[PDB]
Design a protein around this ligand. Structure first.
Ligand SMILES: Cc1cnc(NC(=O)C2CC2)nc1-c1c[nH]c2c(NC(=O)[C@@H](C)N3CCN(C)CC3)cccc12
Length: 286
């Protein structure tokens, strides 16, 4: 018997956890004994509404996650099998976007920086395997406990080819543009340093406890224009070309803000690394 093979007949849907266009994630219980004692699992599958290219994408995501093993990367459990489903561990506390606003009193600057280190460690692991994540935002970072976070979704993750510095995304459908580096918006080119940019934006979110009024979208839209529709991204590029970045969060030391700023150097080659960030945060923690 294969422990990563989940039979459809025992995989019982409890509720929806998240939904996009063409895909969804559900809370299921895997209950082979039929008495509600089975393990809860997060199940990602494709919607009938979805096109044909979306199945290939889900299969590639599965193969990526199947082979990643890290304390700060969400655990692959298996598959339920043309159509297919990805089975992952379920973390009840959900994402930082959901968890931080409800837990401010429990989570001080020290714990915020400890989470930041954990995000950087999972991301550095991903980078060592030549993947660019392309969706690094607080909503995709899961809370295991008050002491542990995990990178939690790999829907947009792509492999960077050997002897190559970036992946060019042909279809950039529903990209998180307010987390994206200039090269990503301008040329659809994704480097490891592009995830470092995104990490800086995620660090901002963490430091603001994912408050919606000071969210990356909100603050950038105030900077450029709430535009503007079709012109949003090109105006956003122009504001970034001018040198304008998200401001220092309230109660955020300049030292932490300077680490953030190094994520947002206009050129990818001049950005900080995840390892440099870890060392920076670790020196602030001691
Ligand atoms: C694995 C897991 C374990 N545990 C919890 N825990 C909980 O939900 C707690 C709160 C009850 N969640 C997840 C989880 C992993 N991915 C999720 C997504 N993913 C997306 O929507 C993807 C498709 N998009 C994200 C945005 N991106 C721009 C495009 C892709 C939505 C909702 C949940 C999950």
């Amino acid at each position: 018997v294969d422990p990563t093979h989940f039979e459809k007949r025992f995989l019982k849907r409890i509720r929806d956890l998240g939904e996009g266009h063409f895909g969804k994630v559900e809370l299921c219980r895997y209950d082979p004994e039929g008495d509600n004692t089975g393990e809860q699992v997060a199940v990602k599958s494709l919607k009938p509404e979805s096109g044909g290219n979306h199945i290939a994408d889900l299969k590639k995501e599965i193969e990526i996650l199947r082979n990643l093993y890290h304390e700060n990367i969400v655990k692959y459990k298996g598959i339920c099998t043309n159509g297919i489903k990805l089975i992952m561990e379920f973390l009840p506390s959900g994402s930082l976007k959901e968890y931080l606003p409800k837990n401010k009193n429990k989570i001080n600057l020290k714990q915020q920086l400890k989470y930041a280190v954990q995000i950087c460690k999972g991301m550095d692991y991903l980078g060592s395997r030549q993947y660019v994540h392309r969706d690094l935002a607080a909503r995709n970072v899961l809370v295991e406990s008050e002491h542990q976070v995990k990178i939690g979704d790999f829907g947009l993750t792509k492999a960077i080819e050997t002897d190559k510095e970036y992946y060019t995304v042909k279809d950039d459908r529903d990209s998180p543009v307010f987390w994206y580096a200039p090269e990503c918006l301008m040329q659809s080119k994704f480097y490891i340093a592009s995830d470092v940019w995104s990490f800086g934006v995620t660090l901002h979110e963490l430091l603001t406890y994912c408050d919606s009024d000071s969210s990356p979208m909100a603050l950038f839209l105030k900077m450029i224009g709430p535009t503007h529709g079709q012109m949003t991204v090109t105006r956003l590029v122009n504001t970034l070309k001018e040198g304008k970045r998200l401001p220092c969060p309230p109660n955020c030391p300049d030292e932490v803000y300077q680490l953030m700023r190094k994520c947002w150097e206009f050129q990818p080659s001049n950005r900080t690394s995840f390892q440099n960030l870890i060392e920076g945060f670790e020196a602030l923690l001691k």
